[PDB]
């Protein structure tokens, strides 16, 4: 029961760098891949083996692939503290990036390297007794993150069919955006990928940026700060696959309980508690307190107001000092609050899980080591607010065909821009249809 992570572009690679660093600390894997606590050498059916393969020498190798169309970012990995952890074939780099151009990442530069990426992925898959699916980390805005990811997703649908594909996407934010055409790249990748991904977790950089300032007193956050925080959400989601437990979810479970309709598969994550060490000092937070924090809009990962929408499904993943009795009471209270509205076609609307391994913080980080934490994955109609903001920015530029020549110069037709935008128009409509009360 195994998962392969694919990290694409600067954002995906740099996010993976934080996630795999956290995985090693959670499992006690050293930067050279050795895990002393593991006594089954060269193999095993342990829970952590879903994400780590093993060699006869006792090394624990991530079941991951790093791909970028320029080597600047992945070279850090090849020389960083965790360079020994990855086999050289796992890290794949071109020589010329996509220049914030979806078309270059999909057609011009992407096709140069797609076949090699699939071959290295296939070698990882052949090392599997049973493969659940793929975890794809990328950014909506970059040329490689959008253009190449869409090509990879389409190719994966062919080589592996209906096998699960889950995305971790980075929604553009002007605070740190390095491209004016990011709206074009996001609408195009979303449309191209929309029918290939079974579930996509979006993260709005602006939301993370505000959370880091407010909750962690970080006066001017950097990608390092943001990426560690994303890692906690990714760690919590994968915790049920990497750690052995009786109250876990797996890819198939929480997919089946979060996605009511194929196109409506964009939940927004919420994590709690996000606290600095100063405030954590002499302050321990209860299961109910962190459970209530998940429904406060301030702690969301996409700028939106769930109060102005309706919940269709909530997945609450607790980890740490959490007892079933506390969890049941917390969710019981939520079901009494009327500020939290569920659609009328979802009476049972809570998937629940508990893992007993406590959260881990990387040394030198800003998050405090807490005893219990919770991640909530909620599919609410409020997420459509995010699509509306990005579609409006798409419209403003496309009305004047601004920047479109860069895409036509790389082979695309104006039809793909309207075709993609009409798909987003339908999706915006689908999100209001599902929010209407039944007859």
């Amino acid at each position: 029961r195994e998962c392969i992570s694919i990290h694409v572009g600067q954002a995906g690679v740099q996010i993976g760098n934080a996630c795999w660093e956290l995985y090693c600390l959670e499992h006690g894997i050293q930067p050279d891949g050795q895990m002393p606590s593991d006594k089954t050498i060269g193999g095993g059916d342990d829970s952590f083996n879903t994400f780590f393969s093993e060699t006869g020498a006792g090394k624990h190798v991530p079941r991951a692939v790093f791909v970028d169309l320029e080597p600047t970012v992945i070279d850090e990995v090849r020389t960083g503290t965790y360079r020994q952890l990855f086999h050289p074939e796992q890290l794949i780099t071109g020589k010329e990036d996509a220049a914030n151009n979806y078309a270059r990442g999909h057609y011009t530069i992407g096709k140069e390297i797609i076949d090699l990426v699939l071959d290295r992925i296939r070698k990882l898959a052949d090392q599997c007794t049973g493969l659940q699916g793929f975890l794809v980390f990328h950014s909506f805005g970059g040329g490689t993150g959008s253009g190449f990811t869409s090509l990879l997703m389409e190719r994966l649908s062919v080589d592996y069919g209906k096998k699960s594909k889950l995305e971790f996407s980075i929604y553009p934010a002007p605070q740190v955006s390095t491209a004016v055409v990011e709206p074009y790249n996001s609408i195009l990748t979303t449309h191209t990928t929309l029918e290939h991904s079974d579930c996509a977790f979006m993260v709005d950089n602006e939301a993370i940026y505000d959370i880091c300032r407010r909750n962690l007193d970080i006066e001017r956050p950097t990608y390092t700060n943001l990426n560690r925080l994303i890692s906690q959400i990714v760690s919590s989601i994968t915790a049920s696959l990497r750690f052995d437990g009786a109250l876990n979810v797996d890819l198939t479970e929480f997919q089946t309980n979060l996605v009511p309709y194929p196109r409506i598969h964009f939940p927004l994550a919420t994590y709690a508690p996000v606290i600095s060490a100063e405030k954590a000092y002499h302050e321990q937070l209860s299961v109910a307190e962190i459970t209530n924090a998940c429904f406060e809009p301030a702690n969301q990962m996409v700028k939106c107001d769930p109060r102005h929408g309706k919940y269709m499904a909530c997945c609450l993943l607790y980890r740490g000092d959490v007892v079933p009795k506390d969890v049941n009471a917390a969710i019981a209270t939520i079901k009494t609050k009327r500020s939290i509205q569920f659609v009328d076609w979802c009476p049972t609307g809570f998937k629940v899980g508990i893992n007993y391994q406590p959260p881990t913080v990387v040394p030198g980080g800003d998050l405090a080591k807490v005893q219990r934490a919770v991640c909530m994955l909620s599919n609410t109609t409020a997420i459509a607010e995010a699509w509306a903001r990005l579609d409006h920015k798409f419209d403003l530029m496309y009305a004047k065909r601004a920047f479109v020549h860069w895409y036509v110069g790389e082979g695309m037709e104006e039809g793909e821009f309207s075709e993609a935008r009409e798909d987003m128009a339908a999706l915006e409509k689908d999100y209001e249809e599902v929010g209407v009360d039944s007859v």
């Binding site: 010329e96 004016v180 001017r220 403003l396 530029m397 601004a402 920047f403």
Partner: protein
């Protein structure tokens, strides 16, 4: 990895271009012998963008020096860094163009262009991944203007998927008395509209006014004017030479700065500009967006900004920069097109320029740039209506229609800038 090939044509290109290499070589710790005498390791992270590496850990500029008057070549060799340039990359002519565009584009430049492209080819083949070319030249002379645009077309012909960037210097009556300068410029603009992805407009009328009005130099010299350009050129290329992720290469810059292929004429700016006989982040920000700090003789408040790139240099509070860029954008909302969201991008480099602690360079694609082209069309049509000095060009084979097409095409470009200046969101 990401290599740029520099080219400089004419006296103007060679003098502004020679200063470019003196300035950036100092910034990277390269002395005229090509040796590295620097302290911090960020000086070499991206040294290969503009410098080839040779045995002995000597760095040689990836530069090609060109002119149709051989005397120029000696001037560069004698200069402060004249011995750093690779000697085979000198490509000299015989006589000189005499400020005749047709000779540099068709007759004497054509006979020399193939020798230049050979040096171009040799330099490009030693690049791990070539990203593009940058040309320094003037539009009023005869060699940089005529042969420069020809070299652009021939390079685009042989490297059509690489970016072509130029630093084009624009004639002014205030700086040179030559009478046919309006002809040469209008003819080169007609070329640069089609064959370059992005062009930094350097206007001597703006450089002279800055040297006279702001720096109080009653008799500015090309050394004074070229001190301004070198500061600008160093600023508008620092994203390309130092670690960062905003407009880090020439294509990423073009994609953020060029909403429409013809509208690729930028309005450079620099701050501070203080006399030797006389600074905070809010001040830097206000000064950049002041018309008196623009290297093009246009007022941005007479038009609208399609896209803007601001580069800050020095040790400073990034939080302070974020606020001030936000402040100036929404305090001047009316001067930014509403139909291009988030069209102002800000980069910060820890390393400041020489002599200063905090610098700010401004790259603006403004519809106000049309004021410059309207100045030239006025001068151009003033003489073309009477066909003055037109025999200089027809004598080399040109027809009168190439002048009308160049005139009409420049007038179309001005009309296009106005179309988007008056455009609405709804």
């Amino acid at each position: 990895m990401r290599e740029i090939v520099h080219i400089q044509a004419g006296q103007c290109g060679n003098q502004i271009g020679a200063k470019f290499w003196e300035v950036i070589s100092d910034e990277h710790g390269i002395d005229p012998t090509g040796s590295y005498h620097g302290d911090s390791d960020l000086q070499l992270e991206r040294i290969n963008v503009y410098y080839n590496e040779a045995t002995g850990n000597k760095y040689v500029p990836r530069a090609i020096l060109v002119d149709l008057e051989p005397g120029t070549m000696d001037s560069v060799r004698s200069g402060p860094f004249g011995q750093i340039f690779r000697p085979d990359n000198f490509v000299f002519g015989q006589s000189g163009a005499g400020n005749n565009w047709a000779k540099g584009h068709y007759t004497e430049g054509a006979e020399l262009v193939d020798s230049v492209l050979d040096v171009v080819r040799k330099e490009s083949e030693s690049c791990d991944c070539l990203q593009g070319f940058q040309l320094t030249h003037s539009l009023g002379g005869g060699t940089g203007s005529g042969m420069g645009t020809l070299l652009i077309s021939k390079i685009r012909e042989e490297y059509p998927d690489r970016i072509m960037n130029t630093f084009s210097v624009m004639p002014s009556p205030k700086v040179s008395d030559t009478v046919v300068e309006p002809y040469n410029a209008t003819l080169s603009v007609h070329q640069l509209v089609e064959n370059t992805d992005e062009t930094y407009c350097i206007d001597n009328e703006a450089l002279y006014d800055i040297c006279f009005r702001t720096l109080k130099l009653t008799t500015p010299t090309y050394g004074d004017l070229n001190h301004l350009v070198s500061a600008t050129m160093s600023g508008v290329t620092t994203c390309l030479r130092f670690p960062g992720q905003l407009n880090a290469d020439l294509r990423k810059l073009a994609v953020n700065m060029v909403p429409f292929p013809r509208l690729h004429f930028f309005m450079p700016g620099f701050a501070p500009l203080t006399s030797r006989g006389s600074l905070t982040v809010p001040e830097l920000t206000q000064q950049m967006f002041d018309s008196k700090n623009m290297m093009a003789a246009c007022d941005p408040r007479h038009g609208r900004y399609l896209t803007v790139a601001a580069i800050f240099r020095g040790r400073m509070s990034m939080k302070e920069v974020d606020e001030q860029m936000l402040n100036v954008q929404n305090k001047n909302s009316s001067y930014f097109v509403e139909w291009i969201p988030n069209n102002v991008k800000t980069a910060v480099c820890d390393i400041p320029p020489r002599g200063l602690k905090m610098s700010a360079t401004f790259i603006g694609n403004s519809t106000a740039i049309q004021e410059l082209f309207k100045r030239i069309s006025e001068q151009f049509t003033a003489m073309f209506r009477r066909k003055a000095f037109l025999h200089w060009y027809t004598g080399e084979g040109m027809d009168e229609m190439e002048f009308t097409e160049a005139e009409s095409n420049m007038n179309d470009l001005v009309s296009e800038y106005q179309q988007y200046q008056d455009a609405t969101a709804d």
